[PDB]
Amino acid sequence: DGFVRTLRARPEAGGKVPVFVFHPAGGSTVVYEPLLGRLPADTPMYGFERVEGSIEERAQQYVPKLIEMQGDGPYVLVGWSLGGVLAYACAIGLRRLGKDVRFVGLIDAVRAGEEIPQTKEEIRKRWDRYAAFAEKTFNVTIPAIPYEQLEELDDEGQVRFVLDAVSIPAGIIEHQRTSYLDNRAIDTAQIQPYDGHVTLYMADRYHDDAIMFEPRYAVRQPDGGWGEYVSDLEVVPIGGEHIQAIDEPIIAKVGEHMSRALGQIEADRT
Numbered sequence: 001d002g003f004v005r006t007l008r009a010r011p012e013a014g015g016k017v018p019v020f021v022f023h024p025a026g027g028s029t030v031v032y033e034p035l036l037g038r039l040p041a042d043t044p045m046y047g048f049e050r051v052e053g054s055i056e057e058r059a060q061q062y063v064p065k066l067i068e069m070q071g072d073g074p075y076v077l078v079g080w081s082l083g084g085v086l087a088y089a090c091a092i093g094l095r096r097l098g099k100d101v102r103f104v105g106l107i108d109a110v111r112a113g114e115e116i117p118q119t120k121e122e123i124r125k126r127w128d129r130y131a132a133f134a135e136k137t138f139n140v141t142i143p144a145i146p147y148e149q150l151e152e153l154d155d156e157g158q159v160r161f162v163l164d165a166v167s168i169p170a171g172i173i174e175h176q177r178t179s180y181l182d183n184r185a186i187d188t189a190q191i192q193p194y195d196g197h198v199t200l201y202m203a204d205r206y207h208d209d210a211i212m213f214e215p216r217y218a219v220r221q222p223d224g225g226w227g228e229y230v231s232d233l234e235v236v237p238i239g240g241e242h243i244q245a246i247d248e249p250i251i252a253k254v255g256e257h258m259s260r261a262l263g264q265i266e267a268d269r270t
Ligand SMILES: CCOC(=O)c1c(-c2ccccc2)oc2ccc(O)c(CN3CCC(C)CC3)c12
Pocket: 026, 110, 175, 176, 177, 179, 180, 181, 183, 184, 186, 187, 206, 209, 210, 211, 213, 214, 217
């Protein structure tokens, strides 16, 4: 219904605390089905799908829905990839409104090892990189990039400008557009500090295609970039690559750890 997917519905009344999961870059919350199978029986789960805007603007849409569904709390918020950033943003908004947030789970939602500057120089370097790949892939020499026109466009306007040159089945255009926009959303996220507990499940590395797009993701800090914003930070190493973190077998380890946290939350209510 709308942007909320029901993965496992909560009972008519009572029951366990729901897990709210948030979509990853370029995908939907169906990716959380393996995690769900590794959580306690009868754990409700609701997935928040894509909405438009900056991270804060998206959280402004999610947070009223979170409160409509769960009221005062307790809130358990989880996400892989972009979803981790969205969950974190929702935790800050809920906490601001005095709601009880008991768990924020970031599944390999790791910041770039060096801050990604949001400057005209970086816009130029980014698009020079993209053009070079376009030339080796589509086997076409590409002329001078109109830097002045690009540098005054939002990310959404930049892809519109790109679709023009191209002039693709609508389905392929929608997937590339939303994946590009969701990834840029990760790049430009401005993280605010959070004073609750955050659990970061950390893989060993980003995938090669990710690193080719933005080489700053080739390096990971021990705290995944979150320690300066989060004082109460716990990191759970899971190994492997980012893309595998959401799936079996690695998700079993995320799920075992998260199940224990949920059990404690349940005991603290009871
Ligand atoms: C799958 C490779 O394509 C990407 O990671 C990026 C895409 C993209 C993916 C699929 C289809 C079309 C585009 O767009 C990006 C824009 C900026 C950017 O930095 C990246 C690289 N990622 C940013 C966020 C990191 C957590 C992961 C890397 C992309």
